[PDB]
Design a protein around this ligand. Structure first.
Ligand SMILES: *P(=O)(O)OC[C@H]1O[C@@](C#N)(c2ccc3c(N)ncnn23)[C@H](O)[C@@H]1O
Ligand SMILES: [Mg+2]
Ligand SMILES: [Mg+2]
Ligand SMILES: [Zn+2]
Ligand SMILES: [Zn+2]
Lengths: 834, 114, 63
RNA sequence: GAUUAAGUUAU
RNA sequence: UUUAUAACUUAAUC
């Protein structure tokens, strides 16, 4: 029978399934020791491997563990998708029944390490040596030394176990009086916000022998790796403290002798307590900059509002700013019957055609805005394997080595569009143009300098979109404050422009698909993989389910280019401002203030780039887990076996960064797992032989990683694999691919779903777009998009372009390479000479 | 100048919002704190004079706002008005199991601190 | 047949919307339900049944 | 060939 | 009352 083991020999290392002294007298008195002349079928490593390598239909060990310890019963698994966090959110209750066993295992491990310290034993703890009752039973590899000076090594044990501590909510009992679940909850003082001593007590209770220093307040951290280390612990401990203690911290201030309420700090779940450095209790007059800062600050709005109890959502309500709730609806789309009659005349929409309408404007009733916001219930506090994440961040950072960055002055910021919303409450009086014009460059620079020493919390406003789709779902967009946007541009714009200007890199944001760009992107991803297949995946609920750890990680990777301009305190306050503005800010949704649990924000300046960082992070995690879960003895290649050994050593045995191994592993991924990444979309060209042997990640490994780290189930129905490179990727950025003869050589052309273009023709979101002058331009754009359909073997697809050209002829009559009524205008858009 | 106009608008809004603040409840909360600094989330919770409840269905109604007075957040609240999603006044006698499908939902309940 | 049903349902919801039906949420919710069901349907019989049910709403008021 | 506007697509 | 980025098209102007 196969069992999970955590192995590190001179020969083999890893965490994988394998086919399976007189120092006991120095430990027999410890009540965490099993009796040796009792034990259960499964160890802690079986649970850890089952939840870290989840596969449905290959999960009988997890079923047996769940039914053995009365988490559920055998009939629970007859329900469809019993394991899915989204289709069956009750599964979290089933996993939470294991929390007490894991907490008792942690306590018994602390007792065992105390006993080893007293007895003078040196040894490495492993999960497979501990029963599911928490008893420790394997001592064969320990070493005697002077009693009272033992040294238990626990890096791998705690690091591997960490993701399960939040999935089972092991620390739930700490919310109760005397840590007993049968007694009532501890009732805290509502004014208590610090909790630093409680955090230290939790750390010493459960992680006494964790070797690295923990900072309850991340403002005391030493670098970004220390920030990640201590934020990971803060995520676990913050689940114990009351939700009302988190967020902006407020104080009474006097201006003109008149009392205001202003935020002088912030209590973060992940970063602890942060206090503002520039606070002055008495002020004679308020400048424009302080007017802006206090208008953005939610303190005034929340303090002046009514108390709100919203039962429609599971999210934490702050205050109602208006006496009446708003129930904004979504209109249906307008119909372009002039174009539909033309299309039917030319023979479309007959029965049995492969081309049919599927994209519509879907109406939404008054519950839409709050119903959509409630999908943040998929965001859950996730603890990461910290050693694995700390290696991944060094590998992920290698993908961003080629870009320049750093802070710029306000006089050189490029703002694409000034005539757009400034957010709440600034949208009440003007657009972004107003605030960019009113503030001089020195005022903008003084506002930016202020955010390097103080945290400014802001309010994000959420609005429903009006957009065509095949899905009934209503889509909302998050509008951020001008105060946050203005400083975020001055922090990030140099790097964002550098990324968007680069060609041939892994991140393909800013690359055009026109004039041969699509062909160049595919030849770049195909680069030199020698048994190539293609793969693509989807992130379910990406914008809502993203853990806060990986968003903070993505923010720190973007801020690594700020070594010469920013100090470490400046960088910490920049991160704290980013968190308080886009991670856990307050959301204005229908006139009421709510706390966003986490996840990304659509209106954030860095959203696409941060999502690209997240996608790369998840892919590197999948590759690392695939490599460490394989049987090292079965790896035929000497080089890959040595690579697996050094990878394990570099994650769990070393703590300094081994730059040479980061370079070598990055080269290995570039050689065998080359990626094309745009936000959350990805195409991978991977070595098929290595993927079949478990040497590089496959869809299985992404499924497992997304289960244990992102809290979602990725079903294979939405994933794809293509075995022939003469075919393109199946689906990338909503475009299919065809190999087309163009001139003397073959090129890859992107083409849309014909239903999408016909929907964009038939339905519009404003009646004014029926005017010929705008309608002609709109159909020129849709014909530029539809043109590659003529190369498709399916004549029903080809006729979609000719319909658009015929309609353009009709419109031009009602009203040569630049004459858009002839096909040569469109053909020129897809040829290399731009 | 737009500069002065927006300065006036921001300062007017900031000073107008103080008609509610500086109530002695706020001072009682802030002064006994060890350092005068309190979480923002507890300020409306402990000091707001009015509570708005939004109820999606009758099962949540019986569990939260049964009777003319109910308790929430360690206080007693007395119902002033109930309105539906159409902002029309709904009498307490109308809200029943048998009548419930006739009412528009959600219901918005406003209450004053006792 | 089906495409005509969908295109007619869209303009029918539009004409209901411009007659201020959405200011009565209890009826607007059912109009939206019928509209989305018609667009998501793949058989013309259910589409016709829901389309006539939706058109009855316009026929009830003065139109 | 540099700003300004409008529009389409993608995320 | 409608965010962020990227690409493209069209019309202007020195
Ligand atoms: P895609 O698969 O469409 O969505 C994933 C990812 O994209 C966003 C980004 N960036 C996104 C999609 C559509 C929009 C709009 N209209 N505005 C802003 N951002 N997006 C989201 O962040 C989402 O997570
Ligand atoms: Mg997605
Ligand atoms: Mg996509
Ligand atoms: Zn630290
Ligand atoms: Zn910088």
């Amino acid at each position: 029978v196969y069992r999970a083991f955590d192995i590190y020999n001179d020969k083999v290392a890893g965490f994988a399934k394998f086919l399976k002294e007189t120092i006991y007298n120095l430990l027999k008195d410890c009540p965490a020791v099993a009796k040796h002349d009792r034990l259960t079928k499964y160890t802690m490593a079986d649970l850890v491997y089952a939840l870290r390598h989840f596969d449905e239909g290959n999960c009988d060990t997890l079923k047996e563990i769940l039914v053995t310890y009365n988490c559920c019963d055998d009939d629970y698994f007859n329900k469809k998708d019993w394991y899915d966090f989204v289709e069956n959110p009750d599964i979290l209750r089933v996993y939470a029944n294991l929390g007490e066993r894991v907490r008792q295992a942690l306590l018994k491990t602390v007792q065992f390490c105390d006993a080893m310290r007293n007895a003078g034993i040196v040894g490495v703890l492993t999960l497979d040596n501990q029963d599911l009752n928490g008893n420790w039973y394997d001592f064969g590899d320990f070493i005697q030394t002077t009693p009272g000076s033992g040294v238990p090594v626990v890096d791998s044990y705690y690091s591997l176990l960490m993701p399960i501590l939040t999935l089972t909510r092991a620390l739930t009992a700490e919310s109760h009086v005397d840590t007993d679940l049968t007694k009532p909850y501890i009732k805290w003082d509502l004014l208590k916000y610090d909790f630093t001593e409680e955090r230290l007590k939790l750390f010493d209770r459960y992680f006494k022998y964790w070797d690295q220093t923990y900072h309850p307040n991340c403002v005391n951290c030493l670098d970004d790796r220390c920030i990640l280390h201590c934020a990971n612990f803060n995520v676990l401990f913050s689940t114990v403290f009351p939700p009302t203690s988190f967020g902006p911290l407020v104080r009474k201030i006097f201006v003109d002798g008149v009392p205001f309420v202003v935020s002088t700090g912030y209590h973060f779940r992940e970063l602890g307590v942060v206090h503002n450095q520039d606070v002055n209790l008495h002020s004679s007059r308020l400048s424009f900059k302080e007017l802006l800062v206090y208008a953005a600050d939610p303190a005034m709005h929340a303090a002046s509002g009514n108390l709100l109890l919203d039962k429609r959502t599971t999210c934490f309500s702050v205050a109602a700013l208006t006496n009446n709730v708003a129930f904004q609806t979504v209109k249906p789309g307008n119909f372009n019957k002039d174009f539909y009659d033309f299309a039917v005349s030319k023979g479309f929409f007959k029965e049995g055609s492969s081309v049919e309408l599927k994209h519509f404007f879907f109406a939404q009733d008054g519950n839409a805005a709050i119903s959509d916001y409630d999908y943040y219930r998929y965001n859950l506090p996730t603890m990461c394997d910290i050693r694995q994440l700390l290696f991944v961040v060094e590998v992920v950072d290698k993908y961003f080595d080629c870009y320049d960055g750093g802070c710029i002055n306000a006089n050189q910021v490029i703002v694409n569009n000034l005539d757009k919303s400034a957010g709440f409450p600034f949208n009440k009086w003007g657009k972004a143009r107003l605030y960019y014009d009113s503030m001089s460059y020195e005022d903008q620079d003084a506002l930016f300098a202020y955010t390097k020493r103080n945290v400014i919390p802001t309010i994000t406003q959420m609005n429903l979109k009006y957009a065509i789709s095949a899905k009934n779902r209503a889509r909302t967009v998050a509008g951020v404050s001008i105060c946050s946007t203005m400083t975020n541009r001055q922090f990030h714009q140099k790097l964002l422009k550098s990324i968007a200007a680069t060609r041939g890199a892994t991140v393909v944001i800013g690359t055009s698909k026109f004039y041969g760009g699509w062909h160049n992107m595919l030849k770049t991803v195909y680069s030199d993989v020698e048994n190539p297949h293609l793969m693509g995946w989807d992130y379910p609920k990406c914008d809502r389910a993203m853990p806060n750890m990986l968003r903070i990680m993505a923010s720190l990777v973007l801020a690594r280019k700020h070594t010469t301009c920013c100090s470490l305190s400046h960088r910490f306050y920049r991160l704290a401002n980013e968190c308080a503005q886009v991670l856990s800010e307050m959301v204005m949704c229908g006139g009421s203030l709510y706390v966003k649990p986490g996840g990304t924000s659509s209106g954030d300046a860095t959203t696409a780039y941060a999502n690209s960082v997240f996608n790369i992070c998840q892919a590197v995690t999948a590759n690392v887990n695939a490599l460490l879960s394989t049987d090292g003895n079965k790896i035929a290649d000497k080089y890959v076996r040595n690579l697996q050994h050094r990878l394990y050593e570099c994650l769990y045995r070393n703590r300094d960064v081994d730059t040479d191994f980061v370079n070598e592993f990055y080269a290995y991924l570039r050689k065998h797992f080359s990626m094309m990444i745009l936000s959350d979309d990805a195409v991978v060209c991977f070595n098929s032989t290595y993927a079949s042997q478990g040497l590089v990640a496959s869809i299985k490994n992404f499924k497992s990683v997304l289960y244990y780290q992102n809290n979602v189930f990725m079903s294979e129905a939405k994933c794809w694999t293509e075995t022939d490179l003469t075919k393109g990727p199946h689906e990338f950025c909503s475009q299919h691919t065809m190999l087309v003869k163009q001139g003397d050589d073959y090129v890859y052309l992107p083409y849309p779903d014909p239903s999408r273009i016909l929907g964009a023709g038939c339905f519009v979101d404003d009646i004014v777009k029926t005017d010929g002058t705008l309608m002609i331009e709109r159909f020129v754009s849709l014909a530029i998009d539809a043109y590659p359909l003529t190369k498709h073997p399916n004549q029903e697809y080809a006729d979609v372009f000719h319909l658009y050209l015929q309609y353009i002829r009709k419109l031009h009559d009602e009203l040569n390479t630049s004459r858009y009524w002839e096909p040569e205008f469109y053909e020129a858009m897809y040829t290399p000479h731009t | 100048d737009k500069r002065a106009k927006v300065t006036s608008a921001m300062q007017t809004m900031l000073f107008t919002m103080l008609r509610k603040l500086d109530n002695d409840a706020l001072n009682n909360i802030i002064n006994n704190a060890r350092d005068g600094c309190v979480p923002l989330n507890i300020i409306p919770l402990t000091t707001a004079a009015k509570l708005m409840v939004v109820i999606p269905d009758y099962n949540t109604y019986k569990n939260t706002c049964d009777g003319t007075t109910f308790t929430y957040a360690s206080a007693l609240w007395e119902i002033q008005q109930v309105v539906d999603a159409d902002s029309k006044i709904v009498q307490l006698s109308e809200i029943s199991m048998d009548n419930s499908p006739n009412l528009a939902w959600p219901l918005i309940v406003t209450a004053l601190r006792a | 047949k089906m495409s005509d049903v969908k295109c007619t349902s869209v303009v029918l919801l539009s004409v209901l919307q411009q007659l201020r039906v959405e200011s009565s949420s209890k009826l607007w919710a059912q109009c939206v339900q019928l509209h989305n069901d018609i667009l998501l349907a793949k058989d013309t019989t259910e589409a016709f049944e829901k389309m006539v049910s939706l058109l009855s709403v316009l026929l009830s008021m003065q139109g």
